[PDB]
Every structure is written in structure tokens, then in C-alpha cells.
Amino acid sequence: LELRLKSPVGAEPAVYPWPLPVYDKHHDAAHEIIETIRWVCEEIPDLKLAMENYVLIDYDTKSFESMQRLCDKYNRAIDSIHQLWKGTTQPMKLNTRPSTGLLRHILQQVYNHSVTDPEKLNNYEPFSPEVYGETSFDLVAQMIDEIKMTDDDLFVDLGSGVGQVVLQVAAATNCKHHYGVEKADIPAKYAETMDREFRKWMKWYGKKHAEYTLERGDFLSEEWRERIANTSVIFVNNFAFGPEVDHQLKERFANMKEGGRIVSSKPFAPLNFRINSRNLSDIGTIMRVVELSPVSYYLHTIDRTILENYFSSLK
Ligand SMILES: Nc1ncnc2c1ncn2[C@@H]1O[C@H](CSCC[C@H](N)C(=O)O)[C@@H](O)[C@H]1O
């Protein structure tokens, strides 16, 4: 007893067992299935012509025969489109990145299949750097929209949790490599399933992502000092890290190259910082800081021009 969804690009079919799993109050797998079908129809205009006669909202999510008919209608449309491509028509171009709406659906799908008990994420020690909170898809999308990233960039999420910031950026951008590093056992374990589910689903949709790695580790380790130094774009949700960890992070950031960037939920230097004789050791001497469009996040850019100009002025 299963439901199967053929891949538009001919990857292995997505197979669901029946009954379908319960996710939470607001989401179940039957509606994920319907939304997947709707999204593939967005992905492939010709699929709409084949599917346009069926009213999706009219099926019965609680009935197996009803959902199996829906899946079979979709699979037959996929076959028909595949025959169209065998003829004069040109197949869908591979290597494309997903549209933002599709990517939001993919990550929700990856998350719901991956994090089985989301309440375990709340089991952290309070008032410690392990306090867990998730940056929303929208904030990450706004960051991707507000900062340039190219194949010359290396992206790191420090304290990557279950890894969904890394996946989103890897799907949306050209960075040479994307990484995230998570110390705590519970999010790091989930991130292994997230990694697996993401590669499977992206292949099933026929969408491309840049290269990425989700690692278990401690970003304060001796090995991570050099890796931070060599990173062009750092994302860190430091909201709960506290002064000692933020101070350790400032020391690492101080080895970054000119033009290196840090996006954080709490600023590492004041926005108004004015360099003078008293503050010369502050990290504000080496970086510009601006608030991203407002929950506020901050973009820091390594600029030693600030410190260099203060010394030239003393002469
Ligand atoms: N020294 C350290 N090394 C690796 N991860 C750390 C760390 N200190 C704290 N963390 C992790 O940082 C995470 C912050 S919650 C942020 C999760 C994710 N990046 C997001 O923004 O959605 C927590 O999961 C915590 O375990």
C-alpha cells in the first residue's frame, strides 16, 4: 500500500507509505503531495495543459483510493509530457535553480520528512549558546536578495542547527562551497537526514544546488579558527550566544580578509561607531555595520580603511 509520484526529470519516483504521516496541526503529507503536484505543474507549463481539467481541491485527503487517483492522474500527465519531449518538443532545462516559491516548498518538505520530533529542538540548556531558534525562510531570502554572492564566495552558517539556512543558500546562490557546523547532538543528527532528503528531493524536481557540507563540530575549535579566516560570507544567529562567545567570535572575524562579510542577529559592533584613541582595539575599527531591512539582522563588512585612516590622521 503506497502512493508514488513520478519525477518530472526521470529520477527515482517519490514513494509514500499509506497511511500518510501526520506532521503537525497545520501540515500533513497529503497536502504536501498536492502542493508538490501543483509545484511541478508550475515547473512545467505543458504539465498544466494535461492537468488543467482536474480540480485539485476537490479530492479527499482522507481516502486512499481518492489520493491514488490523484497521483495516477499526475503520473499519466508526466508520461504524456515525456512523450511530447521524445518528439519535436525540447525537454525542461536541467541545472536551473528553483524559484523562491518552489524552494520554500522543497525546504518545508525536507524539514517535515527530516525533523520527526521538532520538540526535541527545545531541549537545550537555557541561558547558554545552545539556545535553539530558527531563522525564517523569509529572512534568509531577504539576505540572499540584499547581498551579492558569486563563485568566489565561501558561505558558512556558524551554529547551523538542522542546516536549513545552508540548504536555502546553496539552492539559491553560486558560492563555491556552503558549510554549516553544529555542536549540539540533536540538531546535528537531524541535519544528517536534512542533507539526505534535500539531495533526493532536488534531484526529484530536477533542480540544481551549489556544493554544500553539513558538519558536526565546534566553531570555536582550533581547526575552525583558520576556516573562519578563509570564509568570505558568515551567517551566524548569535542572538543567544552571549558576551563571551561573541567576544571569541570577534577574535576569529579579525583574521578575515578585506571585504569579508558577517550577517548576524545581534551586532558585533555599534552601528554609529566613531574611532578614537580609547576604542582602537574594538572590532568596530575593522568593520562597517548596517542593519538589514526590518526582527532585525545586521551586515558587517571587514574594512581596515577605518583603522588605517585613523593612524594616517595622527601623523
Ligand atoms: N560553539 C559552537 N559550535 C557549533 N555550534 C554552536 C556553538 N555554539 C552554539 N552553537 C549552535 O548554534 C545554534 C544557534 S540556533 C541557529 C540555527 C540556524 N543557524 C538558524 O539560524 O536557523 C544552536 O543550534 C547551537 O547549538
From Swiss-Prot:
The modification Phosphoserine is found at residue 293. S-adenosyl-L-methionine binds at residues 132-135, 155-164, 182, 218-219. Transmembrane segments: none annotated. Residues 12-315 form the DOT1 domain. Changing residue 96 to M: Found in a patient with developmental delay and intellectual disability; likely pathogenic. It is linked to Defects in DOTL1 are associated with an autosomal dominant form of global developmental delay and intellectual disability, with or without one or more major congenital anomalies. The patient phenotypes are characterized by central nervous system (CNS) dysfunction, such as mild motor delay and significant speech and language delay, and a range of congenital anomalies, including brain structural anomalies, cardiac defects, varied urogenital features and growth restriction. Variants may cause a gain-of-function effect leading to an increase in cellular H3K79 methylation levels. Interacts with MLLT10. Belongs to the class I-like SAM-binding methyltransferase superfamily. DOT1 family. This is Histone-lysine N-methyltransferase, H3 lysine-79 specific. It comes from Homo sapiens. The lineage of its organism: Eukaryota, Metazoa, Chordata, Craniata, Vertebrata. The gene is DOT1L.
